[PDB]
Design a protein around this ligand. Structure first.
Ligand SMILES: *[C@@H]1O[C@H](CO)[C@@H](O[C@@H]2O[C@H](CO)[C@@H](O)[C@H](O)[C@H]2NC(C)=O)[C@H](O)[C@H]1NC(C)=O
Length: 582
């Protein structure tokens, strides 16, 4: 019989006891006099998509008979074939197997509804038309790929093909040196080729040729490679033999081919200097702010002015500038070429991209650095300059092309930067609880919070925060059972570590304690809380010490003077009150 709402009854027994009493009702299921039909519509975005780019396919599914109101939402498994890669599965088992991966989506028809949506984002790899095929399965918790039957027969084919167009190429170029000298150093044309979409199958081999270098010559054809997932490649043309017989301005044509696709480009302008003339030479001047000396973590700004002997031609190609700056702290780069450090992104704290504009002589590279260690000898920061574009800079190492060494030797700052240690002081020593801000009660746990402020705050974006070991000797000679041998730095340094001590163990209330506190980056001060318990009332002289901390080892005194003691005001503990707030 055909009915609208129907309920089953499942009753199961372990041994003799039933899991549910009197039974477990099952969700409402509708009985249909005929097989429901599944109408379907498809939409594309964009209708025309470049190769190796995502395209949104949207399928709207409409069911002839609405899902029962009281029953559960109907699970639907959209197995979709983009129509361009491989072949569509021939059996429903193939669709079920394919739907496990990203090519198969899972939606749910809500109860009392007649519509559902399935969206996919395929990325085609070949040019031409693509017509997808989609099939619907049921996503029951126990879906057998073999015996399952899709509700859709025959497999729906979207009557709206997507047009996958071929890839495009944007071609830029620059020259090193920007004004080649005839018969001298060989000129190098660096050609940056950018693809409108990243390659996915494998590395692609662009073929770059230069029919004319402005002088009428034709250098040997070059092949450049673009790696998987990359959108940029560099083609290097080493031309030697430029001549000044033709009038000053010149321009070169370069065509780059990828199979059928051909893209032509013309370099803007450039001038070849007369043979025998002295090649233009670059120099660097350096300024610092503030002046020597500076403290640790103080923002130090270096400004380097790069000056060319002669101005760049007004109509020619502007010269890219890559400034790699080493602040002087740590291991210096091995040589000038070693300064081509691998940078994740171009505008980092060590690499700066500038442009010497045509008709201009000087440019400026600005760096901001923080000095961590202390060196009274002074740090001599250095700078190295290359001529490379920002786009081609990251991938020059991958393509095994030597960056253009734009300087004869590394520029070293004239005056070494003498760096002194930061100044840290104990701002306040609060007691909780306390009869007055100077003395605590007796026979109750009292906590001393010491606040330490560093005059130059730990800079944001620092690798790690600073660490301070704070040592305290309250007195009363109970838990250590003896006074410290001497007030010297070493004796208090040798104190036990209780940074992770809890109230259970006997070290929680120790007359001699040593704790570790980390000043986080972007903070100026830290606090250390020490628990104490004054069993007996009497005069007391708590002693406090601060030390630097590194690699879980206690360093020298943090107060910049050997054997510096922060002596709390002497006090006599008085009786505690018994009133309870509430
Ligand atoms: C880049 O060089 C080209 C080639 O010389 C310049 O185009 C022509 O240059 C000749 C040089 O004798 C002039 O007589 C023509 O008048 C130029 N043509 C045009 C349309 O201006 C071109 O001017 C140079 N580019 C710049 C920006 O100066």
């Amino acid at each position: 019989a055909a009915a609208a709402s129907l309920q089953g009854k499942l009753q199961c027994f372990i041994g003799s006891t039933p899991l549910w009493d009197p039974y477990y009702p099952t969700p409402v299921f509708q009985v249909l006099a005929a097989a429901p039909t599944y109408t379907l519509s498809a939409s594309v975005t964009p209708a025309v998509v470049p190769v190796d780019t995502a395209t949104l396919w949207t399928y709207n599914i409409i069911r002839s008979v609405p899902v029962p109101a009281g029953g559960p939402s109907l699970p639907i498994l959209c197995s979709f074939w983009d129509g361009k890669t491989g072949a569509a599965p021939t059996t429903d088992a193939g669709w079920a197997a394919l739907a496990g991966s990203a090519n198969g989506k899972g939606t749910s028809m809500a109860p009392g509804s007649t519509t559902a949506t399935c969206s996919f984002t395929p990325s085609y790899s070949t040019t031409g038309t693509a017509t997808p095929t989609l099939q619907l399965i049921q996503n029951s918790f126990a879906l057998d790929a073999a015996t399952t039957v899709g509700f859709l027969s025959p497999v729906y084919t979207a009557p709206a093909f997507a047009t996958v167009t071929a890839a495009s190429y944007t071609i830029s170029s620059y020259l090193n040196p920007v004004t080649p000298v005839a018969g001298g150093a060989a000129a190098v044309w660096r050609i940056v080729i950018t693809r409108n979409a990243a390659v996915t199958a494998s590395a692609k081999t662009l073929t770059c040729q230069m029919p004319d270098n402005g002088q009428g010559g034709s250098p040997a054809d070059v092949t450049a490679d673009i790696a998987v997932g990359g959108t940029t490649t560099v083609c290097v043309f080493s031309i030697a033999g430029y001549t000044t017989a033709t009038p000053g301005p010149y321009f070169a044509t370069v065509n780059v081919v990828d199979g059928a696709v051909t893209t032509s480009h013309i370099t803007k302008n450039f001038t070849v200097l007369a043979s025998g003339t002295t090649a233009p030479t670059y120099a660097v001047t350096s300024v610092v702010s503030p002046a020597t000396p500076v403290k640790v973590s103080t923002p130090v700004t270096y400004t380097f002015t790069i000056t060319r002997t002669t101005a760049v031609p007004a109509g020619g190609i502007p010269q890219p500038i890559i400034c790699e700056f080493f602040n002087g702290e740590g291991t210096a780069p091995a040589s000038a070429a070693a300064y081509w450090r691998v940078s994740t992104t171009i505008p980092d704290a060590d690499t700066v991209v500038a442009v010497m504009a045509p008709g201009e002589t000087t440019t400026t590279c600005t760096f901001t650095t923080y000095y961590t260690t202390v060196s009274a000898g002074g740090f001599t920061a250095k700078l190295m300059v290359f001529g490379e574009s920002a786009t081609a800079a990251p991938l020059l190492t991958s393509l095994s092309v030597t960056p253009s060494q734009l300087l004869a030797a590394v520029h070293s700052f004239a005056t070494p930067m003498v760096v002194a240690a930061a100044v840290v002081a104990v701002e306040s020593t609060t007691i909780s609880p306390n009869y007055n801000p100077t003395t605590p009660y007796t026979n109750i746990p009292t906590y001393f919070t010491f606040t330490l402020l560093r005059d130059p705050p730990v800079p944001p974006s620092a690798s790690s925060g600073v660490q301070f070991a704070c040592a305290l000797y309250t007195g009363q000679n109970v838990n250590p059972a003896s006074a410290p041998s001497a007030i010297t730095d070493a004796v208090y340094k040798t104190f036990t570590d209780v940074t992770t001590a809890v109230a259970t163990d006997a070290n929680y209330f120790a007359d001699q304690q040593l704790r570790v506190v980390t000043m986080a980056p972007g903070t100026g001060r830290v606090s250390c809380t020490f628990p104490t318990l004054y069993a007996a009332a009497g005069p007391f002289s708590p002693k406090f010490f601060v030390f630097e901390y590194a690699s879980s080892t206690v360093g020298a005194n943090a107060l910049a003077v050997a054997d510096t003691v922060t002596s709390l005001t002497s006090f006599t503990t008085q009786a505690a009150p018994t009133f309870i707030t509430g």
